[PDB]
Amino acid sequence: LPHFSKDDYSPESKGFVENSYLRGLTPQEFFFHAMGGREGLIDTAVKTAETGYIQR
Amino acid sequence: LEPGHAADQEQAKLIRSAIEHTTLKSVTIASEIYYDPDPRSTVIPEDEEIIQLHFSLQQSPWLLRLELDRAAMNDKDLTMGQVGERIKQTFKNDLFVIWSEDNDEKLIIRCRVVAEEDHMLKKIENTMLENITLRGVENIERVVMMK
Amino acid sequence: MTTFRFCRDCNNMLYPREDKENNRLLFECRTCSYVEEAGSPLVYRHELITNIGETAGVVQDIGSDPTLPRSDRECPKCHSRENVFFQSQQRRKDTSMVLFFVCLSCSHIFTSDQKNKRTQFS
Amino acid sequence: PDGEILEHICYDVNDWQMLEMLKPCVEDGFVIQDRETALDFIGRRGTALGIKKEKRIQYAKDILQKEFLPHITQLEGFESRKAFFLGYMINRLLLCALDRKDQDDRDHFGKKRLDL
Amino acid sequence: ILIAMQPEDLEPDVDPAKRIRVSHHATTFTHCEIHPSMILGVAASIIPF
Amino acid sequence: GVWHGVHRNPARLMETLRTLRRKGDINPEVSMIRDIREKELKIFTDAGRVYRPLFIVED
Amino acid sequence: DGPTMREITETIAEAKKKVLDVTKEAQANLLTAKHGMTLRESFEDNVVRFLNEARD
Amino acid sequence: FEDESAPITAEDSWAVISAFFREKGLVSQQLDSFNQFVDYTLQDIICEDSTLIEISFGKIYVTKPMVNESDGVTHALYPQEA
Ligand SMILES: [Zn+2]
Ligand SMILES: [Zn+2]
């Protein structure tokens, strides 16, 4: 993100959400979670579409 | 691994190496084409000792000199002799091969065509780095051991 | 390092030729009739596991670059802890996470690599 | 002249690796040694075999002036402007080929535009 | 650029209730975010927490 | 996108470019990125560039 | 439990060292690449497992 | 008194966002986009190829919205009505 320095390989930088959902997520955590999330839905749409047709 | 040797972490390795496709590319640090015209004296210091050593119990002035890396060289359980007589059995006689031995601090295969030379060599240099199979079965690229 | 030469006159590329008689290396042009004796005998070099490009990026302003991370190690030339570090700028997978730092006082590049083999890093 | 061309591509005389990548380019364009033969070479790969040299050259002269990198300049005197840009292209291309650069991220947003 | 998340990330025990937010290690900030909840669109701007 | 030329001592260009835009004298929407380690300073004026506002932190 | 949260916060902050140590390790060039795996390939591999062993 | 050089607090951001929205509203990307067209880009299209081998086209005048009334006055068109 433009909020870290260049070549930052720490967990916080590279996308470890430290917090529980109870605690709430930092904006980075929130956006990285959003990234992982979008990966999920994207290929939840793939798994639905390919599986749909395999089964047929 | 064969029943009798399953635990032998060293035989797992010895098979791993003898299976994992191991190209010249993976064991050579750099290639260089020198004009080095006299097949006795040489414009390369670190090789004077090696031509001397290959006179004890034709050739173009253009020399293809490969500097090999011990790291991956002994890792893949490999001999200079083995790398050498491989290239020497890959290019029939169509290449004069000579190599530093396994003691010498720098590992070196020196090769000549045997005039449109500098070009046949950059071809052969490639036919080496890419094509020649030092060790392993082709298409087996990584080979991981696991318990 | 096969630093190679262009003709004095026409300024095209020179191509290596052999003095068959005296056994030495020339470099004719193939446009004009120019020719020069060879410097080193090294006509070709193919660096399989490369270095050059790891330093690439080192500018008089590198430290003005705010996105660069800044540590406080000591440079083996002027000891000033005004450093700005990046990883090897080559973009291979088989690159290390070796950091390169630039001293922003004497503009010196040094390295976190404890296996230092090279001298100029160029 | 080679030296000149390479200077447009390779802004670094020590970068022997890049210049050594181009070695065969310099060779690949060996047959052609002056702007007109070059302009003709192009003309011919844009034209039918019937067409006359001048027209051919003139076709290649208009393509380089209007089709080749048109966002630089479409008028006349700007040949160095394209040579240089084209050099820079060949540059970046090789700088990528030499495992010295990451190939462009297609999905970076700064290099997208939203049409509205 | 280098952007601060909250202005208070410029500033030169911790609530156990609070989330755990990253350090402010940089005197290099060229910008700071107005408010990070402005990374959201409209639909998402309605979602509480 | 157009290579317009060259400039030794860019940061002194960069300052001004930034300061001009921060006045109003260069249009705010105009985007200038200096890639220090690339020897490049790319200015952008074309429409379509999605942008957002930020607080300027200056020393 | 108030304390569990400290154990949890500790558990995590105990992995960010592990990750940090492997970072320092690798930036030094002391991490040996696992056979047929790049440094960068195997550094991540470690970090990801640390951060998972952690979450878990 | 509330030093007019005191640093901004996290709270204050909203004020700036208020200002942002006061000024631009929620669909500026549309309007400005369409406006820069009507104001400039429009007239800039009537100057490219504004020459025929003469007839050259000059200024552009954009009316307020109006209707082609079948039987009657070219009428001031109100959005709601439309
Ligand atoms: Zn010449
Ligand atoms: Zn120093």
Side-chain angles (χ1 to χ4, degrees):
Chain A
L1 288 170
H3 309 240
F4 298 90
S5 272
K6 275 171 176 157
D7 298 313
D8 182 337
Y9 284 86
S10 81
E12 318 90 65
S13 176
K14 212 86 175 147
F16 186 55
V17 173
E18 183 176 19
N19 289 295
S20 43
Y21 283 118
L22 177 101
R23 257 164 149 178
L25 273 60
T26 55
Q28 302 89 342
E29 280 162 356
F30 175 83
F31 191 84
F32 288 145
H33 191 22
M35 278 178 67
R38 180 89 112 255
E39 221 223 348
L41 335 173
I42 268 164
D43 32 78
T44 250
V46 175
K47 258 76 155 190
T48 220
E50 275 173 313
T51 303
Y53 155 96
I54 276 183
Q55 211 269 350
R56 286 163 161 270
Chain B
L1 279 49
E2 159 165 42
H5 315 280
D8 300 301
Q9 162 78 299
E10 206 191 339
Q11 195 222 19
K13 288 175 174 190
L14 272 217
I15 279 133
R16 152 208 268 172
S17 66
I19 270 182
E20 184 162 28
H21 186 53
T22 268
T23 40
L24 192 30
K25 194 185 278 216
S26 57
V27 124
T28 320
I29 323 175
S31 66
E32 279 168 335
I33 305 180
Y34 287 90
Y35 180 83
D36 202 84
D38 179 37
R40 268 212 209 145
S41 75
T42 274
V43 207
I44 320 152
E46 327 162 355
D47 282 351
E48 299 197 38
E49 215 186 290
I50 132 170
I51 308 185
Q52 290 162 349
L53 291 182
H54 289 265
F55 259 100
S56 51
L57 206 160
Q58 65 151 45
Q59 308 177 55
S60 73
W62 292 105
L63 172 100
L64 182 45
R65 173 209 217 260
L66 304 165
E67 180 201 352
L68 303 187
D69 171 44
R70 263 159 208 297
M73 251 293 287
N74 62 33
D75 163 286
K76 287 134 206 186
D77 291 297
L78 263 172
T79 318
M80 276 318 301
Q82 286 181 312
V83 174
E85 260 140 2
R86 191 65 199 139
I87 303 158
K88 197 215 175 196
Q89 79 190 319
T90 320
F91 297 117
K92 306 158 200 146
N93 326 310
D94 278 26
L95 204 82
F96 177 79
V97 195
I98 267 188
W99 56 86
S100 73
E101 276 172 323
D102 303 80
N103 256 340
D104 298 47
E105 53 200 35
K106 287 211 168 187
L107 302 148
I108 269 127
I109 319 143
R110 304 171 89 262
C111 339
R112 293 198 149 86
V113 210
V114 51
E116 225 273 58
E117 309 265 26
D118 350 296
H119 225 288
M120 281 181 296
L121 221 40
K122 284 182 200 188
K123 294 165 198 145
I124 281 158
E125 102 98 354
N126 208 285
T127 323
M128 278 192 311
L129 294 182
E130 282 213 59
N131 286 330
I132 309 184
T133 300
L134 305 180
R135 205 161 157 199
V137 162
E138 277 76 356
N139 301 306
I140 279 83
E141 278 166 52
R142 298 177 198 149
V143 178
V144 189
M145 314 178 302
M146 282 307 316
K147 187 133 290 199
Chain C
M1 291 141 283
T2 315
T3 290
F4 65 109
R5 316 209 36 193
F6 311 102
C7 147
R8 165 201 61 198
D9 302 331
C10 63
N11 187 20
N12 269 189
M13 197 181 267
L14 294 163
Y15 305 78
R17 302 315 229 102
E18 167 176 43
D19 198 57
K20 311 215 173 206
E21 301 222 353
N22 281 293
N23 282 300
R24 42 154 219 157
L25 188 58
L26 294 174
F27 260 109
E28 72 188 9
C29 173
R30 34 199 62 169
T31 295
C32 70
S33 270
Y34 183 105
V35 27
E36 50 166 283
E37 66 195 333
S40 66
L42 187 57
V43 153
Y44 178 73
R45 181 104 193 288
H46 178 35
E47 269 189 21
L48 296 141
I49 316 166
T50 330
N51 260 59
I52 159 76
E54 287 197 329
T55 260
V58 179
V59 165
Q60 183 51 51
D61 284 274
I62 200 149
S64 63
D65 192 17
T67 56
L68 275 174
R70 299 174 149 212
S71 76
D72 73 312
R73 297 187 146 197
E74 284 208 357
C75 51
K77 271 193 184 160
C78 81
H79 301 286
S80 68
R81 291 166 280 156
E82 264 265 20
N83 315 293
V84 94
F85 69 93
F86 46 88
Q87 266 159 18
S88 149
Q89 291 299 108
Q90 274 184 344
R91 290 301 179 207
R92 299 149 210 261
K93 298 161 188 205
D94 70 340
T95 316
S96 42
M97 263 148 294
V98 147
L99 310 169
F100 283 66
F101 315 71
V102 191
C103 178
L104 305 185
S105 305
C106 68
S107 49
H108 178 61
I109 327 155
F110 59 102
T111 314
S112 60
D113 201 356
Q114 288 168 35
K115 293 187 202 174
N116 295 301
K117 293 150 225 153
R118 296 222 182 183
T119 324
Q120 294 178 63
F121 307 112
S122 35
Chain D
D2 308 3
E4 256 200 67
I5 295 160
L6 300 183
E7 207 168 62
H8 281 249
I9 305 166
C10 196
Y11 328 102
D12 205 307
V13 204
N14 297 300
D15 189 4
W16 66 270
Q17 294 204 313
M18 189 172 289
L19 283 158
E20 163 74 74
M21 271 274 246
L22 301 147
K23 191 127 303 179
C25 310
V26 170
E27 291 174 325
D28 189 29
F30 182 83
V31 204
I32 278 189
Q33 214 53 60
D34 57 84
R35 183 172 181 161
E36 272 210 329
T37 321
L39 275 178
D40 193 301
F41 182 101
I42 292 184
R44 302 208 288 151
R45 340 257 147 182
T47 258
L49 166 39
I51 278 193
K52 305 185 216 165
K53 182 165 158 166
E54 267 199 359
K55 282 176 281 166
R56 266 201 258 92
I57 289 185
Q58 185 51 35
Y59 188 70
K61 273 219 204 182
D62 288 286
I63 281 165
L64 292 180
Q65 200 222 12
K66 287 163 173 125
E67 293 296 340
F68 171 67
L69 294 178
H71 82 288
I72 276 144
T73 269
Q74 300 224 56
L75 0 155
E76 294 214 30
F78 305 47
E79 284 93 40
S80 55
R81 274 233 198 158
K82 291 182 194 176
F84 265 125
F85 198 95
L86 166 75
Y88 167 72
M89 242 176 296
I90 299 148
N91 182 87
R92 288 203 34 187
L93 159 78
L94 285 170
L95 206 35
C96 185
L98 284 180
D99 281 39
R100 296 188 173 162
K101 274 312 187 46
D102 271 337
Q103 77 172 296
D104 291 59
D105 189 334
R106 297 170 165 276
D107 300 313
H108 191 296
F109 198 66
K111 286 158 197 169
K112 311 278 177 187
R113 296 291 180 287
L114 279 207
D115 285 327
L116 241 163
Chain E
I1 71 196
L2 183 65
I3 316 170
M5 208 54 256
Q6 326 119 55
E8 339 185 302
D9 284 1
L10 303 170
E11 265 174 44
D13 298 295
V14 177
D15 224 330
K18 273 191 193 193
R19 50 199 81 191
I20 318 162
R21 306 179 174 182
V22 187
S23 61
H24 60 250
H25 296 316
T27 319
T28 352
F29 288 134
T30 57
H31 297 96
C32 155
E33 295 284 337
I34 306 214
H35 184 72
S37 86
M38 302 297 282
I39 65 151
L40 307 160
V42 176
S45 267
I46 281 120
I47 313 186
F49 307 113
Chain F
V2 189
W3 196 1
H4 267 271
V6 142
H7 191 87
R8 319 134 177 265
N9 330 344
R12 285 168 167 206
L13 172 56
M14 211 36 212
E15 285 160 28
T16 330
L17 284 191
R18 256 151 202 156
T19 306
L20 276 164
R21 175 227 250 161
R22 290 177 183 177
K23 299 193 210 170
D25 309 316
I26 297 184
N27 195 263
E29 141 205 334
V30 185
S31 151
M32 321 145 315
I33 306 98
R34 185 195 178 194
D35 192 330
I36 313 227
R37 314 147 79 205
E38 203 60 60
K39 296 173 200 189
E40 313 218 340
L41 172 45
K42 293 182 169 132
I43 290 198
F44 289 100
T45 346
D46 75 332
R49 283 156 308 106
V50 180
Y51 65 84
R52 73 215 185 82
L54 290 192
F55 281 143
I56 306 175
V57 177
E58 257 276 9
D59 68 340
Chain G
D1 215 334
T4 283
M5 266 325 287
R6 228 138 315 184
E7 212 160 15
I8 281 164
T9 302
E10 277 168 60
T11 297
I12 281 136
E14 194 198 22
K16 299 195 181 206
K17 289 167 212 166
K18 304 209 173 182
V19 179
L20 181 41
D21 298 340
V22 191
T23 293
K24 290 176 202 172
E25 200 161 326
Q27 286 175 350
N29 201 347
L30 291 188
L31 249 217
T32 302
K34 321 198 155 188
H35 171 97
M37 213 177 316
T38 332
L39 270 43
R40 295 179 171 277
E41 279 186 349
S42 98
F43 156 83
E44 293 276 313
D45 164 55
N46 284 351
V47 181
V48 182
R49 186 198 79 259
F50 291 144
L51 298 161
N52 289 310
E53 281 182 15
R55 176 201 48 210
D56 292 39
Chain H
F1 23 34
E2 336 131 19
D3 258 78
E4 75 172 54
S5 264
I8 272 180
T9 53
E11 150 56 61
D12 295 308
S13 300
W14 295 106
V16 188
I17 283 159
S18 304
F20 174 78
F21 285 121
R22 261 182 273 119
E23 155 139 337
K24 302 192 89 145
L26 296 136
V27 296
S28 83
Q29 23 123 352
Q30 300 291 327
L31 308 181
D32 305 340
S33 183
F34 173 91
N35 283 329
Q36 166 76 50
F37 172 70
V38 152
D39 302 314
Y40 315 78
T41 327
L42 193 59
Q43 175 82 64
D44 274 14
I45 293 163
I46 227 97
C47 293
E48 88 217 17
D49 299 312
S50 84
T51 276
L52 335 159
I53 277 168
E54 257 199 46
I55 310 162
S56 61
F57 315 93
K59 183 157 183 166
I60 289 186
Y61 286 79
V62 207
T63 346
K64 290 281 195 175
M66 52 183 194
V67 211
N68 179 22
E69 223 198 315
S70 41
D71 282 83
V73 176
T74 288
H75 191 70
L77 185 45
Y78 284 109
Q80 184 52 26
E81 181 172 7

